[PDB]
PDB file of C-alpha atoms and ligand atoms in Angstrom:
ATOM      1  CA  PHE B  28      10.534  41.680   3.583  1.00 28.00           C
ATOM      2  CA  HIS B  29      13.543  39.363   4.437  1.00 26.92           C
ATOM      3  CA  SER B  30      14.523  39.042   7.934  1.00 27.28           C
ATOM      4  CA  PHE B  31      18.403  39.156   8.278  1.00 24.67           C
ATOM      5  CA  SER B  32      20.669  38.257  10.913  1.00 23.38           C
ATOM      6  CA  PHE B  33      22.865  41.242  12.224  1.00 24.21           C
ATOM      7  CA  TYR B  34      25.968  39.324  12.047  1.00 22.78           C
ATOM      8  CA  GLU B  35      25.171  38.708   7.911  1.00 21.68           C
ATOM      9  CA  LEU B  36      24.905  42.234   7.378  1.00 21.77           C
ATOM     10  CA  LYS B  37      27.733  43.122   9.538  1.00 16.06           C
ATOM     11  CA  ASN B  38      29.839  40.322   7.514  1.00 14.57           C
ATOM     12  CA  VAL B  39      28.975  41.834   3.869  1.00 14.50           C
ATOM     13  CA  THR B  40      29.623  45.607   4.786  1.00 15.63           C
ATOM     14  CA  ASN B  41      33.466  44.354   5.822  1.00 16.25           C
ATOM     15  CA  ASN B  42      32.223  45.313   9.783  1.00 14.50           C
ATOM     16  CA  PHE B  43      30.217  48.022   8.740  1.00 12.18           C
ATOM     17  CA  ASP B  44      33.346  49.812   7.404  1.00 12.84           C
ATOM     18  CA  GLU B  45      32.415  53.557   8.273  1.00 15.28           C
ATOM     19  CA  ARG B  46      35.362  54.880   5.734  1.00 15.97           C
ATOM     20  CA  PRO B  47      33.709  56.201   2.212  1.00 17.46           C
ATOM     21  CA  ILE B  48      33.813  53.810  -0.506  1.00 17.78           C
ATOM     22  CA  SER B  49      36.215  56.162  -2.402  1.00 18.83           C
ATOM     23  CA  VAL B  50      38.941  55.617   0.343  1.00 17.68           C
ATOM     24  CA  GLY B  51      38.468  51.733   0.773  1.00 17.59           C
ATOM     25  CA  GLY B  52      35.701  51.351   3.162  1.00 16.98           C
ATOM     26  CA  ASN B  53      31.617  50.590   2.701  1.00 13.82           C
ATOM     27  CA  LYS B  54      29.857  54.158   3.664  1.00 13.30           C
ATOM     28  CA  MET B  55      27.934  55.587   0.816  1.00 10.48           C
ATOM     29  CA  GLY B  56      26.005  57.913   3.175  1.00 12.55           C
ATOM     30  CA  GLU B  57      24.771  59.351   6.637  1.00 11.35           C
ATOM     31  CA  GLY B  58      22.074  61.330   8.241  1.00  9.56           C
ATOM     32  CA  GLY B  59      20.639  62.357  11.026  1.00 14.93           C
ATOM     33  CA  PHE B  60      19.336  58.786  11.805  1.00 11.83           C
ATOM     34  CA  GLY B  61      21.929  56.487  10.499  1.00 13.25           C
ATOM     35  CA  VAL B  62      24.636  55.502   8.041  1.00 13.65           C
ATOM     36  CA  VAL B  63      24.495  53.524   4.645  1.00 10.13           C
ATOM     37  CA  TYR B  64      26.610  51.048   3.650  1.00  7.32           C
ATOM     38  CA  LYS B  65      27.200  48.945   0.593  1.00  7.83           C
ATOM     39  CA  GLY B  66      26.874  45.267   1.244  1.00  5.69           C
ATOM     40  CA  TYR B  67      26.390  42.157  -1.082  1.00  7.10           C
ATOM     41  CA  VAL B  68      23.674  39.501  -0.168  1.00  6.28           C
ATOM     42  CA  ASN B  69      23.070  36.494  -2.701  1.00  3.05           C
ATOM     43  CA  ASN B  70      25.199  37.598  -5.882  1.00  2.00           C
ATOM     44  CA  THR B  71      23.333  40.620  -5.354  1.00  3.76           C
ATOM     45  CA  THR B  72      24.567  44.189  -4.070  1.00  3.21           C
ATOM     46  CA  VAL B  73      22.634  45.615  -1.460  1.00  2.03           C
ATOM     47  CA  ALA B  74      22.850  48.698   0.935  1.00  3.47           C
ATOM     48  CA  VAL B  75      22.314  48.615   4.436  1.00  2.00           C
ATOM     49  CA  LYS B  76      21.358  51.507   6.605  1.00  2.00           C
ATOM     50  CA  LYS B  77      22.504  50.966  10.260  1.00  2.00           C
ATOM     51  CA  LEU B  78      20.435  53.332  12.530  1.00  2.00           C
ATOM     52  CA  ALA B  79      22.010  55.153  15.046  1.00  2.00           C
ATOM     53  CA  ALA B  80      21.180  58.486  17.220  1.00  2.00           C
ATOM     54  CA  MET B  81      23.654  60.895  15.189  1.00  2.00           C
ATOM     55  CA  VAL B  82      21.179  64.028  15.581  1.00  2.00           C
ATOM     56  CA  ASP B  83      19.955  63.429  19.321  1.00  2.00           C
ATOM     57  CA  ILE B  84      16.489  61.436  19.300  1.00  2.00           C
ATOM     58  CA  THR B  85      15.798  58.259  21.709  1.00  2.00           C
ATOM     59  CA  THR B  86      16.359  55.050  21.436  1.00  2.00           C
ATOM     60  CA  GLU B  87      12.413  54.367  21.641  1.00  2.00           C
ATOM     61  CA  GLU B  88      11.814  57.221  18.724  1.00  2.00           C
ATOM     62  CA  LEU B  89      14.658  55.523  16.539  1.00  2.00           C
ATOM     63  CA  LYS B  90      12.663  52.299  16.843  1.00  2.00           C
ATOM     64  CA  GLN B  91       9.309  53.736  15.913  1.00  2.00           C
ATOM     65  CA  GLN B  92      10.901  55.474  12.994  1.00  2.00           C
ATOM     66  CA  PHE B  93      12.250  51.818  12.157  1.00  2.00           C
ATOM     67  CA  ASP B  94       8.876  50.515  12.652  1.00  2.00           C
ATOM     68  CA  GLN B  95       7.022  53.337  10.706  1.00  2.00           C
ATOM     69  CA  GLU B  96       9.604  52.885   7.289  1.00  2.00           C
ATOM     70  CA  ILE B  97       8.728  48.876   7.245  1.00  2.00           C
ATOM     71  CA  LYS B  98       4.983  49.678   7.606  1.00  2.00           C
ATOM     72  CA  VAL B  99       5.157  52.395   4.931  1.00  2.00           C
ATOM     73  CA  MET B 100       6.859  50.034   2.521  1.00  2.00           C
ATOM     74  CA  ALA B 101       4.552  47.168   2.742  1.00  2.00           C
ATOM     75  CA  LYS B 102       1.585  49.474   1.979  1.00  2.00           C
ATOM     76  CA  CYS B 103       3.353  51.881  -0.915  1.00  2.00           C
ATOM     77  CA  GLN B 104       4.976  49.887  -3.985  1.00  2.00           C
ATOM     78  CA  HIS B 105       5.579  52.421  -6.809  1.00  2.00           C
ATOM     79  CA  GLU B 106       8.489  53.106  -9.830  1.00  2.00           C
ATOM     80  CA  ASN B 107       9.257  56.275  -7.743  1.00  2.00           C
ATOM     81  CA  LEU B 108       9.683  54.989  -4.357  1.00  2.00           C
ATOM     82  CA  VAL B 109      13.099  53.112  -3.515  1.00  2.00           C
ATOM     83  CA  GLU B 110      12.419  49.249  -2.710  1.00  2.00           C
ATOM     84  CA  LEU B 111      13.232  47.906   0.535  1.00  2.00           C
ATOM     85  CA  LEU B 112      13.775  44.050   0.653  1.00  2.00           C
ATOM     86  CA  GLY B 113      14.707  43.190   4.261  1.00  2.00           C
ATOM     87  CA  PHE B 114      15.478  44.367   7.482  1.00  2.00           C
ATOM     88  CA  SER B 115      17.318  43.520  11.014  1.00  2.00           C
ATOM     89  CA  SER B 116      16.599  43.767  14.638  1.00  2.00           C
ATOM     90  CA  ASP B 117      18.170  40.868  16.396  1.00  2.00           C
ATOM     91  CA  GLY B 118      21.829  42.168  17.083  1.00  2.00           C
ATOM     92  CA  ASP B 119      23.483  45.133  18.228  1.00  2.00           C
ATOM     93  CA  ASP B 120      21.697  47.715  16.112  1.00  2.00           C
ATOM     94  CA  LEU B 121      18.856  48.046  13.926  1.00  2.00           C
ATOM     95  CA  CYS B 122      19.518  47.677   9.797  1.00  2.00           C
ATOM     96  CA  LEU B 123      17.168  48.241   7.007  1.00  2.00           C
ATOM     97  CA  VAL B 124      18.025  46.791   3.533  1.00  2.00           C
ATOM     98  CA  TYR B 125      17.606  48.287   0.384  1.00  2.00           C
ATOM     99  CA  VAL B 126      17.653  47.395  -3.584  1.00  2.00           C
ATOM    100  CA  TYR B 127      21.005  49.319  -4.534  1.00  2.00           C
ATOM    101  CA  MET B 128      20.851  52.649  -6.137  1.00  2.00           C
ATOM    102  CA  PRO B 129      24.417  53.153  -8.279  1.00  2.00           C
ATOM    103  CA  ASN B 130      23.873  56.541  -8.814  1.00  2.00           C
ATOM    104  CA  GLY B 131      23.210  57.557  -4.965  1.00  2.00           C
ATOM    105  CA  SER B 132      21.443  60.755  -3.585  1.00  2.00           C
ATOM    106  CA  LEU B 133      20.391  63.619  -5.847  1.00  2.00           C
ATOM    107  CA  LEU B 134      21.788  65.720  -3.503  1.00  2.00           C
ATOM    108  CA  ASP B 135      25.281  64.036  -4.040  1.00  2.00           C
ATOM    109  CA  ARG B 136      24.865  63.905  -7.596  1.00  2.00           C
ATOM    110  CA  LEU B 137      23.995  67.616  -7.817  1.00  2.00           C
ATOM    111  CA  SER B 138      27.333  68.110  -6.000  1.00  2.00           C
ATOM    112  CA  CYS B 139      29.177  65.684  -8.278  1.00  2.00           C
ATOM    113  CA  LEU B 140      30.461  64.190  -5.276  1.00  2.00           C
ATOM    114  CA  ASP B 141      33.534  61.661  -5.676  1.00  2.00           C
ATOM    115  CA  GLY B 142      33.874  63.101  -9.132  1.00  2.00           C
ATOM    116  CA  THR B 143      30.810  62.090 -10.985  1.00  2.00           C
ATOM    117  CA  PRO B 144      30.014  63.667 -14.224  1.00  2.00           C
ATOM    118  CA  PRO B 145      27.291  66.721 -13.823  1.00  2.00           C
ATOM    119  CA  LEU B 146      23.488  65.987 -14.453  1.00  2.00           C
ATOM    120  CA  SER B 147      22.308  67.126 -17.895  1.00  2.00           C
ATOM    121  CA  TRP B 148      19.116  69.219 -18.125  1.00  2.00           C
ATOM    122  CA  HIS B 149      17.682  66.389 -20.103  1.00  2.00           C
ATOM    123  CA  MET B 150      18.334  64.012 -16.751  1.00  2.00           C
ATOM    124  CA  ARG B 151      16.973  66.751 -14.495  1.00  2.00           C
ATOM    125  CA  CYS B 152      13.902  67.055 -15.987  1.00  2.00           C
ATOM    126  CA  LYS B 153      13.309  63.389 -16.122  1.00  2.00           C
ATOM    127  CA  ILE B 154      14.412  63.161 -12.268  1.00  2.00           C
ATOM    128  CA  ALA B 155      11.951  66.218 -11.322  1.00  2.00           C
ATOM    129  CA  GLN B 156       8.785  64.097 -13.107  1.00  2.00           C
ATOM    130  CA  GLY B 157       9.813  61.096 -11.419  1.00  2.00           C
ATOM    131  CA  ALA B 158      10.307  62.766  -7.940  1.00  2.00           C
ATOM    132  CA  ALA B 159       6.788  64.364  -8.452  1.00  2.00           C
ATOM    133  CA  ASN B 160       5.376  61.126  -9.470  1.00  2.00           C
ATOM    134  CA  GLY B 161       6.430  59.135  -6.305  1.00  2.00           C
ATOM    135  CA  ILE B 162       5.293  62.205  -4.355  1.00  2.00           C
ATOM    136  CA  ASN B 163       1.749  61.826  -6.305  1.00  2.00           C
ATOM    137  CA  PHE B 164       1.664  58.188  -5.531  1.00  2.00           C
ATOM    138  CA  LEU B 165       2.333  58.918  -1.519  1.00  2.00           C
ATOM    139  CA  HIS B 166      -0.535  61.845  -1.716  1.00  2.00           C
ATOM    140  CA  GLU B 167      -2.906  59.565  -3.258  1.00  2.00           C
ATOM    141  CA  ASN B 168      -2.506  56.819  -0.871  1.00  2.00           C
ATOM    142  CA  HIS B 169      -3.125  59.323   1.922  1.00  2.00           C
ATOM    143  CA  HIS B 170       0.732  59.494   3.099  1.00  2.00           C
ATOM    144  CA  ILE B 171       2.826  62.850   3.910  1.00  2.00           C
ATOM    145  CA  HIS B 172       6.376  61.910   3.608  1.00  2.00           C
ATOM    146  CA  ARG B 173       7.764  65.121   6.004  1.00  2.00           C
ATOM    147  CA  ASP B 174      11.180  65.040   4.844  1.00  2.00           C
ATOM    148  CA  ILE B 175      11.330  65.758   0.771  1.00  2.00           C
ATOM    149  CA  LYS B 176      14.787  66.915   0.172  1.00  2.00           C
ATOM    150  CA  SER B 177      17.427  65.938  -2.448  1.00  2.00           C
ATOM    151  CA  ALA B 178      19.346  63.701   0.023  1.00  2.00           C
ATOM    152  CA  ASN B 179      15.731  61.691   0.132  1.00  2.00           C
ATOM    153  CA  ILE B 180      15.746  61.175  -3.714  1.00  2.00           C
ATOM    154  CA  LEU B 181      17.896  58.405  -4.695  1.00  2.00           C
ATOM    155  CA  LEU B 182      18.900  57.468  -8.506  1.00  2.00           C
ATOM    156  CA  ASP B 183      18.973  53.856  -9.935  1.00  2.00           C
ATOM    157  CA  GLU B 184      20.812  52.360 -12.806  1.00  2.00           C
ATOM    158  CA  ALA B 185      18.748  54.454 -15.313  1.00  2.00           C
ATOM    159  CA  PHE B 186      18.949  57.570 -13.008  1.00  2.00           C
ATOM    160  CA  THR B 187      14.957  56.899 -12.161  1.00  2.00           C
ATOM    161  CA  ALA B 188      14.129  58.886  -9.224  1.00  2.00           C
ATOM    162  CA  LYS B 189      13.248  56.767  -6.107  1.00  2.00           C
ATOM    163  CA  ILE B 190      12.208  58.791  -3.099  1.00  2.00           C
ATOM    164  CA  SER B 191      13.404  57.642   0.225  1.00  2.00           C
ATOM    165  CA  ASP B 192      13.525  57.638   3.948  1.00  2.00           C
ATOM    166  CA  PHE B 193      10.064  57.290   5.250  1.00  2.00           C
ATOM    167  CA  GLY B 194      10.619  56.897   8.917  1.00  2.00           C
ATOM    168  CA  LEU B 195       8.756  60.256   9.328  1.00  2.00           C
ATOM    169  CA  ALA B 196       5.737  59.716   7.125  1.00  2.00           C
ATOM    170  CA  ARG B 197       2.430  60.104   8.067  1.00  2.00           C
ATOM    171  CA  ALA B 198      -1.158  58.556   7.203  1.00  2.00           C
ATOM    172  CA  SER B 199      -3.724  61.695   6.704  1.00  2.00           C
ATOM    173  CA  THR B 205      -5.323  70.016   9.541  1.00  2.00           C
ATOM    174  CA  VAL B 206      -3.512  68.112  12.105  1.00  2.00           C
ATOM    175  CA  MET B 207      -1.133  69.590  14.803  1.00  2.00           C
ATOM    176  CA  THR B 208       2.108  67.990  16.275  1.00  2.00           C
ATOM    177  CA  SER B 209       4.109  68.577  19.448  1.00  2.00           C
ATOM    178  CA  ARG B 210       7.181  66.883  17.952  1.00  2.00           C
ATOM    179  CA  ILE B 211       8.144  69.382  15.120  1.00  2.00           C
ATOM    180  CA  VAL B 212      10.363  67.149  12.848  1.00  2.00           C
ATOM    181  CA  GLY B 213      12.156  67.417   9.146  1.00  2.00           C
ATOM    182  CA  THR B 214      15.197  69.256   7.609  1.00  2.00           C
ATOM    183  CA  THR B 215      14.763  73.077   8.475  1.00  2.00           C
ATOM    184  CA  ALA B 216      16.165  74.457   5.134  1.00  2.00           C
ATOM    185  CA  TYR B 217      13.328  72.606   3.148  1.00  2.00           C
ATOM    186  CA  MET B 218      10.476  72.913   5.793  1.00  2.00           C
ATOM    187  CA  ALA B 219       7.215  74.966   5.069  1.00  2.00           C
ATOM    188  CA  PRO B 220       6.269  77.594   7.424  1.00  2.00           C
ATOM    189  CA  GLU B 221       3.276  75.864   8.883  1.00  2.00           C
ATOM    190  CA  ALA B 222       5.460  72.770   9.289  1.00  2.00           C
ATOM    191  CA  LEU B 223       7.672  74.750  11.222  1.00  2.00           C
ATOM    192  CA  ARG B 224       4.604  75.649  13.643  1.00  2.00           C
ATOM    193  CA  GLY B 225       3.973  71.717  13.834  1.00  2.00           C
ATOM    194  CA  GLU B 226       0.985  71.596  11.342  1.00  2.00           C
ATOM    195  CA  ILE B 227       0.816  68.112   9.524  1.00  2.00           C
ATOM    196  CA  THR B 228      -0.263  68.355   6.086  1.00  2.00           C
ATOM    197  CA  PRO B 229       0.759  67.150   2.612  1.00  2.00           C
ATOM    198  CA  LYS B 230       1.075  71.009   1.370  1.00  2.00           C
ATOM    199  CA  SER B 231       3.920  71.054   3.617  1.00  2.00           C
ATOM    200  CA  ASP B 232       5.361  68.325   0.968  1.00  2.00           C
ATOM    201  CA  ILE B 233       4.910  70.646  -2.082  1.00  2.00           C
ATOM    202  CA  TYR B 234       6.927  73.441  -0.492  1.00  2.00           C
ATOM    203  CA  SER B 235      10.073  71.304   0.181  1.00  2.00           C
ATOM    204  CA  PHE B 236       9.663  69.831  -3.520  1.00  2.00           C
ATOM    205  CA  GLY B 237       9.668  73.481  -4.568  1.00  2.00           C
ATOM    206  CA  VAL B 238      13.134  74.159  -2.991  1.00  2.00           C
ATOM    207  CA  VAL B 239      14.188  70.471  -4.585  1.00  2.00           C
ATOM    208  CA  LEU B 240      13.187  72.077  -7.847  1.00  2.00           C
ATOM    209  CA  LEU B 241      15.687  75.072  -7.003  1.00  2.00           C
ATOM    210  CA  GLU B 242      18.489  72.776  -5.983  1.00  2.00           C
ATOM    211  CA  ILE B 243      17.868  71.164  -9.362  1.00  2.00           C
ATOM    212  CA  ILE B 244      17.956  74.465 -11.389  1.00  2.00           C
ATOM    213  CA  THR B 245      20.819  76.086  -9.823  1.00  2.00           C
ATOM    214  CA  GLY B 246      23.045  73.124  -8.509  1.00  2.00           C
ATOM    215  CA  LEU B 247      23.257  74.904  -5.203  1.00  2.00           C
ATOM    216  CA  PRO B 248      22.772  73.172  -1.891  1.00  2.00           C
ATOM    217  CA  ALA B 249      19.912  74.069   0.361  1.00  2.00           C
ATOM    218  CA  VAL B 250      21.939  75.672   3.118  1.00  2.00           C
ATOM    219  CA  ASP B 251      25.402  76.602   2.929  1.00  2.00           C
ATOM    220  CA  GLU B 252      26.801  78.543   5.692  1.00  2.00           C
ATOM    221  CA  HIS B 253      29.677  80.152   3.742  1.00  2.00           C
ATOM    222  CA  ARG B 254      26.979  81.194   1.083  1.00  2.00           C
ATOM    223  CA  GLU B 255      25.284  84.706   0.474  1.00  2.00           C
ATOM    224  CA  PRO B 256      22.439  84.100   0.855  1.00  2.00           C
ATOM    225  CA  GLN B 257      22.833  81.040   3.292  1.00  2.00           C
ATOM    226  CA  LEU B 258      19.393  79.544   2.233  1.00  2.00           C
ATOM    227  CA  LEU B 259      18.593  78.709  -1.019  1.00  2.00           C
ATOM    228  CA  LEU B 260      15.143  79.385  -0.610  1.00  2.00           C
ATOM    229  CA  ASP B 261      15.755  83.447  -0.163  1.00  2.00           C
ATOM    230  CA  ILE B 262      16.926  83.247  -4.003  1.00  2.00           C
ATOM    231  CA  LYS B 263      13.151  83.391  -4.866  1.00  2.00           C
ATOM    232  CA  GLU B 264      12.761  86.543  -3.038  1.00  2.00           C
ATOM    233  CA  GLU B 265      15.916  88.059  -4.619  1.00  2.00           C
ATOM    234  CA  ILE B 266      14.294  86.969  -7.999  1.00  2.00           C
ATOM    235  CA  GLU B 267      10.676  88.682  -7.439  1.00  2.00           C
ATOM    236  CA  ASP B 268      12.036  91.666  -5.696  1.00  2.00           C
ATOM    237  CA  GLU B 269      14.219  91.837  -9.527  1.00  2.00           C
ATOM    238  CA  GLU B 270      17.403  92.246  -7.566  1.00  2.00           C
ATOM    239  CA  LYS B 271      18.450  89.160  -9.891  1.00  2.00           C
ATOM    240  CA  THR B 272      16.929  86.598 -12.521  1.00  2.00           C
ATOM    241  CA  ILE B 273      17.079  82.980 -12.870  1.00  2.00           C
ATOM    242  CA  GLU B 274      19.459  83.158 -15.169  1.00  2.00           C
ATOM    243  CA  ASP B 275      21.963  84.553 -12.582  1.00  2.00           C
ATOM    244  CA  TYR B 276      21.469  81.265 -10.594  1.00  2.00           C
ATOM    245  CA  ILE B 277      21.303  78.584 -13.152  1.00  2.00           C
ATOM    246  CA  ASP B 278      23.368  75.506 -12.343  1.00  2.00           C
ATOM    247  CA  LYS B 279      26.844  76.209 -15.212  1.00  2.00           C
ATOM    248  CA  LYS B 280      27.843  72.499 -15.249  1.00  2.00           C
ATOM    249  CA  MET B 281      25.100  72.189 -17.956  1.00  2.00           C
ATOM    250  CA  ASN B 282      25.168  72.544 -21.693  1.00  2.00           C
ATOM    251  CA  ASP B 283      21.801  71.243 -22.928  1.00  2.00           C
ATOM    252  CA  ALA B 284      19.639  73.543 -21.038  1.00  2.00           C
ATOM    253  CA  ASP B 285      17.223  76.220 -22.834  1.00  2.00           C
ATOM    254  CA  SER B 286      15.672  79.443 -21.053  1.00  2.00           C
ATOM    255  CA  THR B 287      11.962  78.571 -22.089  1.00  2.00           C
ATOM    256  CA  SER B 288      12.215  75.130 -20.001  1.00  2.00           C
ATOM    257  CA  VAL B 289      14.403  76.158 -17.130  1.00  2.00           C
ATOM    258  CA  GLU B 290      11.609  79.299 -16.909  1.00  2.00           C
ATOM    259  CA  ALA B 291       8.788  76.597 -16.481  1.00  2.00           C
ATOM    260  CA  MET B 292      10.823  74.471 -13.759  1.00  2.00           C
ATOM    261  CA  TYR B 293      11.429  77.983 -12.140  1.00  2.00           C
ATOM    262  CA  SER B 294       7.801  78.894 -12.404  1.00  2.00           C
ATOM    263  CA  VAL B 295       6.709  75.413 -10.716  1.00  2.00           C
ATOM    264  CA  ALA B 296       9.253  75.657  -8.067  1.00  2.00           C
ATOM    265  CA  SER B 297       8.121  79.379  -7.606  1.00  2.00           C
ATOM    266  CA  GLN B 298       4.341  78.183  -7.166  1.00  2.00           C
ATOM    267  CA  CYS B 299       5.342  75.269  -4.649  1.00  2.00           C
ATOM    268  CA  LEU B 300       7.044  77.681  -2.482  1.00  2.00           C
ATOM    269  CA  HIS B 301       3.904  80.337  -1.935  1.00  2.00           C
ATOM    270  CA  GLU B 302       4.350  80.847   1.844  1.00  2.00           C
ATOM    271  CA  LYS B 303       0.188  80.269   2.150  1.00  2.00           C
ATOM    272  CA  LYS B 304      -0.292  77.132   1.772  1.00  2.00           C
ATOM    273  CA  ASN B 305      -3.929  77.314   0.296  1.00  2.00           C
ATOM    274  CA  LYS B 306      -2.097  78.944  -2.765  1.00  2.00           C
ATOM    275  CA  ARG B 307       0.220  76.076  -3.581  1.00  2.00           C
ATOM    276  CA  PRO B 308      -0.858  74.028  -6.416  1.00  2.00           C
ATOM    277  CA  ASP B 309      -1.407  70.221  -5.162  1.00  2.00           C
ATOM    278  CA  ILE B 310       0.959  67.408  -6.501  1.00  2.00           C
ATOM    279  CA  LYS B 311      -1.433  66.317  -9.334  1.00  2.00           C
ATOM    280  CA  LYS B 312      -1.039  70.232 -10.794  1.00  2.00           C
ATOM    281  CA  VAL B 313       2.724  69.858 -10.070  1.00  2.00           C
ATOM    282  CA  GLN B 314       3.171  66.470 -12.248  1.00  2.00           C
ATOM    283  CA  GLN B 315       0.775  68.322 -15.141  1.00  2.00           C
ATOM    284  CA  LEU B 316       3.330  71.462 -15.307  1.00  2.00           C
ATOM    285  CA  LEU B 317       6.274  69.093 -15.267  1.00  2.00           C
ATOM    286  CA  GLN B 318       4.941  67.109 -18.070  1.00  2.00           C
ATOM    287  CA  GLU B 319       3.946  70.407 -19.912  1.00  2.00           C
ATOM    288  CA  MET B 320       7.492  71.654 -19.548  1.00  2.00           C
ATOM    289  CA  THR B 321       8.969  68.585 -21.470  1.00  2.00           C
TER     290      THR B 321
HETATM  291  C1  8CG F 401      21.286  57.933   6.142  1.00  2.00           C
HETATM  292  C2  8CG F 401      21.495  58.418   4.694  1.00  2.00           C
HETATM  293  C3  8CG F 401      20.043  58.920   4.216  1.00  2.00           C
HETATM  294  C4  8CG F 401      18.942  57.755   3.886  1.00  2.00           C
HETATM  295  F1  8CG F 401      19.333  56.641   4.001  1.00  2.00           F
HETATM  296  C5  8CG F 401      18.304  57.995   2.931  1.00  2.00           C
HETATM  297  O1  8CG F 401      17.404  57.548   2.361  1.00  2.00           O
HETATM  298  N1  8CG F 401      18.636  59.364   2.484  1.00  2.00           N
HETATM  299  C6  8CG F 401      20.016  59.717   3.085  1.00  2.00           C
HETATM  300  C7  8CG F 401      21.546  59.403   1.850  1.00  2.00           C
HETATM  301  O2  8CG F 401      21.209  58.213   1.506  1.00  2.00           O
HETATM  302  C8  8CG F 401      21.847  57.596   0.626  1.00  2.00           C
HETATM  303  N2  8CG F 401      23.100  58.240   0.202  1.00  2.00           N
HETATM  304  C9  8CG F 401      23.718  58.072  -0.481  1.00  2.00           C
HETATM  305  C10 8CG F 401      23.664  56.756  -1.326  1.00  2.00           C
HETATM  306  C11 8CG F 401      22.619  56.038  -0.977  1.00  2.00           C
HETATM  307  C12 8CG F 401      21.934  54.683  -1.696  1.00  2.00           C
HETATM  308  C13 8CG F 401      21.011  54.154  -0.641  1.00  2.00           C
HETATM  309  C14 8CG F 401      20.705  52.682  -1.787  1.00  2.00           C
HETATM  310  N3  8CG F 401      19.608  52.049  -1.789  1.00  2.00           N
HETATM  311  O3  8CG F 401      21.394  52.448  -2.484  1.00  2.00           O
HETATM  312  C15 8CG F 401      20.264  54.474  -0.038  1.00  2.00           C
HETATM  313  O4  8CG F 401      19.416  53.652   0.461  1.00  2.00           O
HETATM  314  C16 8CG F 401      18.339  54.018   1.604  1.00  2.00           C
HETATM  315  C17 8CG F 401      20.495  55.725   0.480  1.00  2.00           C
HETATM  316  C18 8CG F 401      21.609  56.212   0.405  1.00  2.00           C
END
């Protein structure tokens, strides 16, 4: 990967202009570990992630996540993983430079952030297949992602799904004392500190529910607050998947929606050993289409 000067990245992002693009700035997104800015290097549009302790972690832990991301990127190259172009470690803050994803995150496209048109059911099926292909590549290469979520599924110029954020990824059960991930997506065993690829399957199940419903995984002003709770409502015959299907599509059919819900439901088994592995998930998503 190309070594950038912090100052060149500062220069091409209009001094890390924290205002969103929609208001004239360079900010494309943000999370607990940093902010993503639109940049322009050598006649190529790029994304620059500037690392920052947004959700309280140490500078040493932020540096370990920076090193882990570069290490995972050097070992894992695939059609369904975002491509790292370079990094910066010389100046004021750590930066990671990526291939520009013109369609941003699946989370933002599902919410239609900035007025983007809703994703068709056809597009959503391709995205789910692509994301499963990327997770499959990771598990085949003995890596556990640990943070599968719609904010970590990016969308390129062809709406091809690209899994992102490998700062927490682990080479492979095993237990840890540092419980990390996004709670609204975490498997029960992951919440207890277990490190297993079976947890990535569970989180992917939550992503499939977001794809079907267009609803975020957590919404404090919604009943139920957690999306994974709709599975219980459907199972207990209180509601149907039909009641939750995203209304912002005109090309969905009952058969393929029920087929995707069935995959999501199997991924969301509370007992890790009853969940399908990633290869079975891929097969089921291929059969859906
Ligand atoms: C700090 C934000 C976190 C983290 F960066 C991540 O992987 N998921 C989150 C959201 O990220 C993004 N949101 C919108 C748009 C985004 C475009 C790109 C991109 N290559 O053009 C991007 O690259 C990595 C991240 C983008």
